[PDB]
Amino acid sequence: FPRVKNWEVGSITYDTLSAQAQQDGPCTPRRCLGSLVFPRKLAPEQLLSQARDFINQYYSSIKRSGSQAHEQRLQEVEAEVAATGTYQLRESELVFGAKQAWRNAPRCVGRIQWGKLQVFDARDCRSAQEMFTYICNHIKYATNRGNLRSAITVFPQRCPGRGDFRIWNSQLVRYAGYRQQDGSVRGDPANVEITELCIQHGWTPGNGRFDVLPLLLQAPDEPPELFLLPPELVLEVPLEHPTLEWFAALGLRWYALPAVSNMLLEIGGLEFPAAPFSGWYMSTEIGTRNLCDPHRYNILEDVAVCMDLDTRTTSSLWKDKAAVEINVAVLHSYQLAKVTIVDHHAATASFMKHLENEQKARGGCPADWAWIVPPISGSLTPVFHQEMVNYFLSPAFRYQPDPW
Amino acid sequence: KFPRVKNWEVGSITYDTLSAQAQQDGPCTPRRCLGSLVFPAPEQLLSQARDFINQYYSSIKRSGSQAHEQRLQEVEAEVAATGTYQLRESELVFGAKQAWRNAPRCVGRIQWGKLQVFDARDCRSAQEMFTYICNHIKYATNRGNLRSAITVFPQRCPGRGDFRIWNSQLVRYAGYRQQDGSVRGDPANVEITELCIQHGWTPGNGRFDVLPLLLQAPDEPPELFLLPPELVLEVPLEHPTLEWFAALGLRWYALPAVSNMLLEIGGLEFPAAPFSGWYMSTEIGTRNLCDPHRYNILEDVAVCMDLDTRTTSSLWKDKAAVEINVAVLHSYQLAKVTIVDHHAATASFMKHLENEQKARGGCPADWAWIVPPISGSLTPVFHQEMVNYFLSPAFRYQPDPW
Numbered sequence: 001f002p003r004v005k006n007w008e009v010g011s012i013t014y015d016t017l018s019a020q021a022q023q024d025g026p027c028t029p030r031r032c033l034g035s036l037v038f039p040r041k042l043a044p045e046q047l048l049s050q051a052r053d054f055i056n057q058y059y060s061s062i063k064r065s066g067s068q069a070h071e072q073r074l075q076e077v078e079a080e081v082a083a084t085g086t087y088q089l090r091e092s093e094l095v096f097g098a099k100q101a102w103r104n105a106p107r108c109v110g111r112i113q114w115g116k117l118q119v120f121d122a123r124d125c126r127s128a129q130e131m132f133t134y135i136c137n138h139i140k141y142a143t144n145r146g147n148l149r150s151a152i153t154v155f156p157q158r159c160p161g162r163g164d165f166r167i168w169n170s171q172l173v174r175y176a177g178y179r180q181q182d183g184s185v186r187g188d189p190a191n192v193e194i195t196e197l198c199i200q201h202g203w204t205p206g207n208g209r210f211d212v213l214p215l216l217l218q219a220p221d222e223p224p225e226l227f228l229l230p231p232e233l234v235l236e237v238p239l240e241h242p243t244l245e246w247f248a249a250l251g252l253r254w255y256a257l258p259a260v261s262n263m264l265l266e267i268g269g270l271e272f273p274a275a276p277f278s279g280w281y282m283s284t285e286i287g288t289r290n291l292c293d294p295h296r297y298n299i300l301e302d303v304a305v306c307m308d309l310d311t312r313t314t315s316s317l318w319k320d321k322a323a324v325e326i327n328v329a330v331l332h333s334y335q336l337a338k339v340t341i342v343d344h345h346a347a348t349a350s351f352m353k354h355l356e357n358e359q360k361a362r363g364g365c366p367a368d369w370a371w372i373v374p375p376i377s378g379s380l381t382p383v384f385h386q387e388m389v390n391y392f393l394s395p396a397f398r399y400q401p402d403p404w
Numbered sequence: 405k406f407p408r409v410k411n412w413e414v415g416s417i418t419y420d421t422l423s424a425q426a427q428q429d430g431p432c433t434p435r436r437c438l439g440s441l442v443f444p445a446p447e448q449l450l451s452q453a454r455d456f457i458n459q460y461y462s463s464i465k466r467s468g469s470q471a472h473e474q475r476l477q478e479v480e481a482e483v484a485a486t487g488t489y490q491l492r493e494s495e496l497v498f499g500a501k502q503a504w505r506n507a508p509r510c511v512g513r514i515q516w517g518k519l520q521v522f523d524a525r526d527c528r529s530a531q532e533m534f535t536y537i538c539n540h541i542k543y544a545t546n547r548g549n550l551r552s553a554i555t556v557f558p559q560r561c562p563g564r565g566d567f568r569i570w571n572s573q574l575v576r577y578a579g580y581r582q583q584d585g586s587v588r589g590d591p592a593n594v595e596i597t598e599l600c601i602q603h604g605w606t607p608g609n610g611r612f613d614v615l616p617l618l619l620q621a622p623d624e625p626p627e628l629f630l631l632p633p634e635l636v637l638e639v640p641l642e643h644p645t646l647e648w649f650a651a652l653g654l655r656w657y658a659l660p661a662v663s664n665m666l667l668e669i670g671g672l673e674f675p676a677a678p679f680s681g682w683y684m685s686t687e688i689g690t691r692n693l694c695d696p697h698r699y700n701i702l703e704d705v706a707v708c709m710d711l712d713t714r715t716t717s718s719l720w721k722d723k724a725a726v727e728i729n730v731a732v733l734h735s736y737q738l739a740k741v742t743i744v745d746h747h748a749a750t751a752s753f754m755k756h757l758e759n760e761q762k763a764r765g766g767c768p769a770d771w772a773w774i775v776p777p778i779s780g781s782l783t784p785v786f787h788q789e790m791v792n793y794f795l796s797p798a799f800r801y802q803p804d805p806w
């Protein structure tokens with residue numbers, strides 16, 4: 001049972017929940033690999049034991065372990081896979097699984113919200129236009145005129161033999177990335193690959209550096225079909241600074257809804273390769289990562305010239321001063337537009353109280369230090385001084401190969 | 405079957421074949437990762453010694469020679485007669501450098517080859533220990549043009565007690581308990597301050613009182629030694645455009661000299677081997693002055709800046725912190741005391757990683773310690789994956805001798 005200490009206060013807890021960790025990660029007693037983004041790389045008898053475990057913990061969570069429909073439900077899944085080779089999840093189970101996969105996401109700092117999550121069942125789906133209308137319901141409900149609401153929608157589970165639903169965009173909302181005559185990029189260099197595929201499936205390109213991409217949606221077996229998104233459904237925030245009058249003239253924008261559409265949900269031994277989820281942004285994800293990373297929009301040097309900073313010596317900390325203003329402008333702009341957003345101080349303080357909750361509930365909580373600590377002002381937030389344990393519980397979201 | 409390591413800012417790919425030779429185990433398993441934890445006989449003394457000797461004779465491109473096999477046969481028969489062996493002077497210098505080279509949480513390692521090793525293995529007493537330390541401080545400080553140095557006191561040996569420096573650093577500030585239960589001075593140093601007092605020291609009452617040295621000779625109580633003030637170079641902190649900053653009274657010292665770690669070379673253990681370099685500015689500005697459990701000046705700075713401290717979304721903490729760091733960098737540059745900022749430091753470490761891949765095929769690095777505590781993703785180390793493992797020779801934590 002790992003002893004975990006908080007170095008700001010001195011408190012000590014023990015992770016007894018780690019002792020129930022399954023899917024072995026990447027580390028060994030000889031070498032630690034916690035800093036790798038993708039750990040490693042990417043006869044149905046094992047379906048039973050994964051469904052048995054998941055159903056067992058479903059009934060513990062609602063008191064009904066021992067007697068009643070608990071043992072009963074064990075038999076239906078036994079007979080359903082003995083007949084068909086897969087099984088269908090009940091509605092409450094799909095909702096309980098979805099929430100647990102969020103609760104178990106080691107790198108998510110927003111997990112204090114894990115209990116409030118709207119789960120749209122789309123297992124009826126069987127068409128590309130069908131999912132496109134499913135996706136537009138999610139976005140509409142999730143955006144909610146800017147008072148954002150956590151949502152996931154679950155499309156039909158992978159079946160042995162015959163194909164899979166797959167959203168080809170990594171997010172539902174993503175900006176174009178076109179290569180110049182220079183080979184350099186106008187737009188988001190993160191999305192130069194998917195922009196390449198959008199065009200070669202009949203998309204006509206656009207203006208420049210803030211073009212919303214179309215959704216490449218893939219019904220089983222048949223190829224991907226492009227789907228344009230209505231501008232009305234894509235809520236965006238133009239970026240302005242509360243006191244730097246020129247920042248708005250830089251013409252920077254970002255969208256409201258972070259909605260990840262390329263991860264695979266796994267509940268009770270069933271894989272849902274199309275299950276896009278969405279929450280709201282932490283300000284540093286936009287300001288520091290999306291806009292300041294050297295391989296993203298790389299705006300930091302441009303904002304520093306406008307602030308008339310000394311970009312000729314790193315010891316002037318001009319990068320640090322420029323970044324903070326970019327984060328200030330993001331927070332101000334989203335707030336001015338009444339769009340839900342959270343600063344990294346508020347967000348990490350909530351994660352600490354999530355840790356304390358999860359200590360009482362389950363005796364621990366899987367957490368990935370490097371992704372919990374903000375990308376600016378790390379040691380100024382409480383999680384910096386908090387030791388953490390990372391391990392992999394099910395249900396979970398996993399990374400998955402891309403369909404090409 | 406070696407770890408694939410990716411740099412995300414650029415797209416580089418390399419593999420860490422040096423990890424496979426890792427000669428110790430750490431706290432991680434396939435079941436769970438503990439990377440974020442701060443604190444993670446003859447035949448085995450002989451097998452460590454052989455790996456070191458092999459390392460040394462490799463570095464002087466003399467592997468597998470007669471001079472090589474001689475020294476192997478030599479140390480083996482010395483362990484037989486006495487249970488231990490002695491390093492030659494060149495072997496000691498190489499081992500101290502390798503320990504620095506192998507230190508996984510050190511961002512200043514691009515320098516590892518430039519190290520001044522002082523051989524104090526003939527030291528006989530605490531008084532003499534004091535003299536060797538004062539000279540270390542004088543040479544490393546060098547009137548503000550700092551030099552990397554290490555002093556190596558006698559090794560652990562059967563029959564006698566260890567030399568120990570009780571102080572965690574050669575220069576530290578007193579931490580005095582209050583009547584509010586509060587702490588005047590540095591709260592990290594409240595215990596060593598109590599220790600010093602009960603061993604005879606007359607305490608002050610400032611917030612930047614330099615502590616005496618508690619020095620332990622074999623089988624003796626610790627003895628108290630005052631550092632002559634003119635040996636301890638200090639830098640008063642001011643801000644270049646915030647003139648009220650000087651009225652805080654804040655200071656920090658030139659020389660970071662860590663004195664409580666253990667140096668291991670070829671199975672030998674040196675429990676007293678203080679080493680020193682020069683500060684990276686975030687250690688002073690961010691950690692030592694802004695940690696809530698350290699001097700904790702952040703809120704008082706931000707109020708003086710007229711920042712809005714009612715709400716976190718004004719980012720008052722980030723703004724005050726960046727200006728506390730600007731003051732540190734400016735104050736040291738004004739006082740002509742060596743200092744590196746986290747941007748230059750992390751850029752040099754990137755060069756170290758590339759040097760190390762070509763040289764040894766990888767490099768042990770602790771990402772959570774290499775990435776600076778402010779402006780992380782603005783530096784190039786944030787976007788570099790790293791492999792953490794324990795190589796020997798090495799520095800190691802050891803328990804407090806009290």
Ligand code: HEM
Nearest residue numbers: 102105106107108109110113150277278279280281282397
């Ligand atoms: C409600 C507000 C939320 C916030 C502020 C938030 C924030 C974050 C942040 C900051 C990361 C780090 C990733 C990065 O920065 O690169 C992350 C990762 C992640 N989030 Fe959350 N998130 C929220 C809601 C959700 C929801 C609703 C889900 C799913 C139902 C979710 C699941 C995940 C997963 C699966 C990952 C990464 C996979 C892994 O860590 O292994 N989050 N989130």
Ligand code: HEM
Nearest residue numbers: 504507508509510511512552554679680681682683684799
């Ligand atoms: C000359 C410039 C140097 C710089 C800028 C530097 C910087 C650093 C920093 C910032 C840390 C992490 C401290 C923290 O934030 O808690 C560190 C750790 C460390 N450094 Fe360096 N250092 C320098 C020289 C040296 C020298 C000369 C030695 C030894 C001869 C050394 C050995 C170590 C060790 C042992 C650690 C702890 C590593 C671990 O526990 O894995 N450093 N250094």
Ligand SMILES: CCCOc1ccc(-c2ccc3c(C)cc(N)nc3c2)cc1CN
Nearest residue numbers: 037110258259260277278279280281282285
């Ligand atoms: C690049 C390999 C994987 O990276 C990842 C992996 C995951 C997420 C991610 C996923 C969901 C989020 C939600 C719901 C809200 C939010 N506020 N943020 C999120 C961030 C970002 C990245 C970007 N690095």
Ligand SMILES: CCCOc1ccc(-c2ccc3c(C)cc(N)nc3c2)cc1CN
Nearest residue numbers: 442512660661662679680681682683684687
């Ligand atoms: C308490 C767990 C271990 O912490 C540690 C561990 C090590 C060092 C350390 C050691 C040597 C340094 C040198 C030579 C120069 C410099 N510029 N910095 C240093 C920092 C600081 C801390 C502070 N936390």
Ligand SMILES: C[C@H](O)[C@H](O)[C@H]1CNc2nc(N)[nH]c(=O)c2N1
Nearest residue numbers: 035036037370371786787788789
């Ligand atoms: C190399 C390093 O592990 C990698 O760049 C990680 C570090 N921490 C991160 N943390 C968050 N939140 N998002 C990221 O993309 C990363 N990247």
Ligand SMILES: C[C@H](O)[C@H](O)[C@H]1CNc2nc(N)[nH]c(=O)c2N1
Nearest residue numbers: 007384385386387440442772773
């Ligand atoms: C809990 C946490 O891992 C711990 O406080 C570490 C994090 N990384 C660090 N990194 C450096 N360089 N110095 C530190 O003191 C710490 N503290």
Ligand SMILES: [Cl-]
Nearest residue numbers: 258285286290
């Ligand atoms: Cl994003």
Ligand SMILES: [Cl-]
Nearest residue numbers: 660687688692
């Ligand atoms: Cl220090």
Ligand SMILES: [Gd]
Nearest residue numbers: 305306307308
């Ligand atoms: Gd101007």
Ligand SMILES: [Gd]
Nearest residue numbers: 644645646647
């Ligand atoms: Gd001024």
Ligand SMILES: [Zn+2]
Nearest residue numbers: 027032432437
């Ligand atoms: Zn690990």
